[PDB]
Design a protein around this ligand. Structure first.
Ligand SMILES: *[C@@H]1O[C@H](CO)[C@@H](O)[C@H](O)[C@H]1NC(C)=O
Ligand SMILES: *[C@@H]1O[C@H](CO)[C@@H](O)[C@H](O)[C@H]1NC(C)=O
Lengths: 50, 50, 27, 50, 100, 50, 49
């Protein structure tokens, strides 16, 4: 069933801000009371999220 | 319903682990000159100087 | 007093903050 | 080290060998019509030999 | 009958298994899943997150490892090494020595 | 005079990475009625397990 | 910094000797070992100076 529904209403897309969010553990290594520098794909701080 | 969509870019982060191994804080490297200084010094605190 | 240091020597020794075992490195 | 590994079940040269290898063709007299089968070459061994 | 053939490709169906008893308090060369080393393995009190497989201290040295069977954390410490020194009064007064 | 060094040798008592107990169920052709045929051959592949 | 310099390729396949030994045959596994030896000697000499 391709249904192909209808009755679509248009509004502009709204943006908002990323308040220090979107950080994941890059590896499976345990650390304790240390500062570690990593280089990988991340969501930048204070970006425009839809 | 409400939801938010963003994107990822290749960045460099400095991550802070507590005694129990969970990431409790992070700092970006290409946000501010202050963030650049923090990443260079590998610390979350900077003293007076150049 | 523990050891035989003076008041000022104790202050100096507690003021300075200080190491482990490595692969080939000894102290 | 050129392998041909069955020949290295048979005859092996060291890593720092110094000397000369000389080979030539013997299709005229080593192999001829009507049976030539008297050479054997040790298909496989238990382990590599020094 | 099967086909004995070779072709260059990243493996998808592949994995080893040897199994050996776990020995503590005796330094030895060890090979966990992928990670190899040498040292003495002892019980630990560190707490890992459920997805974490091995600890690591400053200067990137493997410090603790979780075993795949019991999911327990073990400390790795190298077994002893050092130097030896010979203390002599000179081979003009005597020939006996001490060793440190 | 510091003459030489000493170190403790391993006891050879080695360690593990066992428990294949995942044990994906794929054995049905091993003792089935028909294995294959000259013109009933499929694409026999093994993947996503051991 | 001396200890941290120990996990570096210096142009070799890896930074750990055991994997180089396991994944390569002795005739041509020696070049990687030589590169690692060269780099580690250089770092140690700089530390001493
Ligand atoms: C870490 O976990 C322990 C419980 O094992 C808890 O007592 C302690 O407060 C935790 N650390 C922090 C910083 O919350
Ligand atoms: C696999 O692991 C479980 C728990 O992780 C443990 O009972 C044992 O080591 C294995 N189970 C078997 C062999 O049934």
């Amino acid at each position: 069933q391709c249904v192909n529904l209808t009755t679509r209403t248009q509004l502009p897309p709204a943006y908002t801000n990323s308040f220090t969010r979107g950080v994941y553990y890059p590896d499976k290594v345990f650390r304790s009371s240390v500062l570690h520098s990593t280089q990988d794909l991340f969501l930048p701080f204070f970006s425009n999220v839809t | 319903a409400a939801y938010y969509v963003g994107y990822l870019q290749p960045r460099t982060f400095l991550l802070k682990y507590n005694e129990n191994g969970t990431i409790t804080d992070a700092v970006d490297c290409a946000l501010d000159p202050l963030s650049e200084t923090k990443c260079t010094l590998k610390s979350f605190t900077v003293e007076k100087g150049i | 007093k523990p050891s035989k240091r003076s008041f000022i020597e104790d202050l100096l020794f507690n003021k300075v903050t200080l190491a482990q075992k490595f692969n080939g490195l000894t102290v | 080290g050129q392998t041909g590994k069955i020949a290295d079940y048979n005859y092996k040269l060291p890593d720092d060998f110094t000397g000369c290898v000389i080979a030539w063709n013997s299709n005229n007299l080593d192999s001829k019509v009507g049976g030539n089968y008297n050479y054997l070459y040790r298909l496989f061994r238990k382990s590599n030999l020094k | 009958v099967l086909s004995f053939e070779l072709l260059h490709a990243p493996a998808t169906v592949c994995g080893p298994k040897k199994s050996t008893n776990l020995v503590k308090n005796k330094c030895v060369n060890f090979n966990f899943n992928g990670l190899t080393g040498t040292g003495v393995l002892t019980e630990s009190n560190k707490k890992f997150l459920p997805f974490q497989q091995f600890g690591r201290d400053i200067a990137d040295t493997t410090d603790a490892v979780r075993d795949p069977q019991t999911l327990e954390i073990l400390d790795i410490t190298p077994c002893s090494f050092g130097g030896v020194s010979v203390i002599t009064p000179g081979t003009n007064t005597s020939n006996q020595v001490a060793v440190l | 005079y510091q003459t030489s060094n000493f170190r403790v040798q391993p006891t050879e008592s080695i360690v593990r990475f066992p428990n294949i107990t995942n044990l994906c169920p794929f054995g049905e052709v091993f003792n089935a009625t028909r294995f294959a045929s000259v013109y009933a051959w499929n694409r026999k592949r093994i993947s996503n397990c051991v | 910094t001396l200890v941290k310099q120990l996990s570096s390729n210096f142009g070799a396949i890896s930074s750990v000797l055991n994997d180089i030994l396991s994944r390569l045959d002795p005739p041509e596994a020696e070049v990687q070992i030589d590169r690692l030896i060269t780099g580690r000697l250089q770092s140690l000499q700089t530390y001493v100076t």
